[PDB]
Amino acid sequence: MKIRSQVGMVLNLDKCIGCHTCSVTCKNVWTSREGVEYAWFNNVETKPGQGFPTDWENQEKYKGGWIRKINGKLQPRMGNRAMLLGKIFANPHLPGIDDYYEPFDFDYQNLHTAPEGSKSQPIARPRSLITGERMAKIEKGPNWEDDLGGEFDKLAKDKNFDNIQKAMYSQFENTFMMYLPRLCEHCLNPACVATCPSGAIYKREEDGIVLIDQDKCRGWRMCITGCPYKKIYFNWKSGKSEKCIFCYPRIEAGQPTVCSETCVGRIRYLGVLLYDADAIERAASTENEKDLYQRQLDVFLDPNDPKVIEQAIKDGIPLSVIEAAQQSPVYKMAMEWKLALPLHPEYRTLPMVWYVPPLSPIQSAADAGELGSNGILPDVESLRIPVQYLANLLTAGDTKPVLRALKRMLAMRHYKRAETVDGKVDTRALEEVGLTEAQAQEMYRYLAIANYEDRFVVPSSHRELAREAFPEKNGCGFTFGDGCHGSDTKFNLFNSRRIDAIDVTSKTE
């Protein structure tokens, strides 16, 4: 038993309006540099579709994630340690730039400088940001399949259509589409960390954010394959890999990530989850992949349990973090209401960015239909998005937890309608899904009203602990180049000293 904490995230897909604002703000802040212009730490994909990079969910092709061997031990799908090193001269599974898209820009200046007497109206043609050459045509982009852009036969190659008789969905009346925004999952059992030969990737003890050390990374580019969500992007210019950093500079002081605070649909929740790090391997190596979801919930701890609170304190978790964990919207959605589910738990990484599945308009039928258990509102069985598709995406193919999540959302709607339209108490749908009125009212407070203080409950990462905040507050940021940052030993060849440190030792003890 070793308790650690992390700010987890829940995305309510039912409220996602597929606008990509989250993607644009992340890009402007973190990846507008040459080398990562093609990298979208947060990207939104329309489903059905193959996504970015193309077919990233196809692990037989990309080799991401973990496998559980016959002896019960975990091994990265890319190979054990020696197998991985043996692939280092040329990663045979590596995604190529064309699997993302060839980044482009346009010759806007031609509009300004076109010469007098041009025979035709001037225009801005595309140019590659990789070669600087004219591109005859743009053939791909990071969001090429947006809103079912492409023939159904091509979009339906989507890995999540596995085991589904998909022909009926090619009919106009049965059309459906949904949005899947995604970023790094900052996993408890990250495959990237395990697949980096230099050990440059690590999970931060205090807040669970997973980072690629830009000093220590040697550019072995094996981690990109290891990550089954394909959320690590090679910076083709620096020769090192980069990934979503969970906006740690903001999280550290208790602010939401940029994509969370800028989410227009108000679908992202941030909250602490306390977990038992000693149980991670046992949970990720459970024999049946349909048990990974529950095995992960079992690694999450109850923050209001005094046994957990005392252990957390013993293990160094700050008081304000335990307190935040006690009012965590993420804990409520994942553990109490069972509305949030992991993204592809079968990869065995114990992901920490979860999702509430979306509702959808009712399916096509012979007539206008009849009142169901929910009156004029939908019954879960009538929703048009096939539940098996959502289960392939979130629960390793088990439709049971997906149906429970959708049914509970619909039950909340039925209960609230009785209250606000009929002025009556009707808990029939709630009873059917095992929810109490108090739970439905709380769900409603967080999902519907969703006040800012309820969507984001991020505590400080407490940068003062086990460190020296005082000299740092006084001298951080004067980037003159003291050449002493980044090492614990004081000796340095340039005979310099750290600008933000105290070199004259007190002699009075």
Binding site: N91, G219, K237, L465, G483
Partner: protein, 217 residues
């Protein structure tokens, strides 16, 4: 000629070695962000699997041979091993190297994003490997290992700081002198090129626990 002889084989080796070492340390301490393999694979995957593996498997074969051959079974038996096993490795190395160079110069995305140092260092490695293979027919003229004894004597004098190293080379074929000079030049240029990736061969990975977590620091 005697002046150039002492310069290249008695002086230059220590200049190259000093630069190699202090340059590596200085770049490690002040240039971590520049310390990377600089993969170009994602920009053009075509032919990389074959080329990079031939090149690296070949050059590591040569490395093992050169390492033990010059720093440590009769010498003439050692020489046969070097000509046959080293020669085979050198052929693999040279084919991979040439394919990599063709790619770096003519594959548009790789050429557009290359640094001049990448073209220079690989060109010198291809030339050095070819010079290496070219010494084989000269070694064949002395199967008793006499030329190898000279080269090994020189190398050993150099690494133990015994003056007069160039004397061991008396009468060795010119081809060997060129190979030796380009080889040392590679060490001189090493810290200012991508070759620093060699220092970082990920040996520790084989025994490392999978999950890494860093404490507050």
């Amino acid at each position: 000629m005697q002046f150039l002889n002492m310069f290249f084989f008695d002086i230059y080796p220590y200049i190259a070695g000093a630069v190699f070492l202090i340059g590596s340390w200085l770049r490690y301490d002040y240039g971590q962000y520049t310390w990377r393999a600089a993969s170009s694979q994602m920009l053009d995957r075509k032919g990389m699997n074959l080329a990079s593996n031939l090149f690296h498997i070949g050059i590591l074969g040569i490395f093992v041979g050169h390492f033990f051959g010059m720093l440590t079974l009769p010498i003439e038996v050692a020489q046969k091993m070097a000509m046959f096993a080293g020669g085979a490795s050198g052929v693999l190395c040279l084919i991979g190297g040439v394919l990599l160079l063709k790619r770096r110069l003519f594959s548009p995305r790789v050429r557009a994003t290359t640094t001049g140092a990448d073209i220079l260092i690989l060109s010198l490695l291809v030339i050095q490997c070819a010079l290496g293979l070219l010494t084989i027919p000269f070694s064949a003229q002395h199967m008793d290992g006499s030329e190898m004894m000279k080269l090994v004597g020189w190398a050993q004098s150099v690494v133990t700081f015994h003056g007069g190293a160039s004397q061991h080379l008396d009468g060795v074929a010119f081809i060997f002198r060129l190979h030796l000079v380009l080889g040392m030049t590679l060490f001189l240029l090493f810290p200012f090129s991508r070759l620093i990736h060699i220092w970082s061969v990920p040996v520790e990975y084989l025994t490392r626990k999978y999950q890494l977590v860093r404490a507050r620091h």
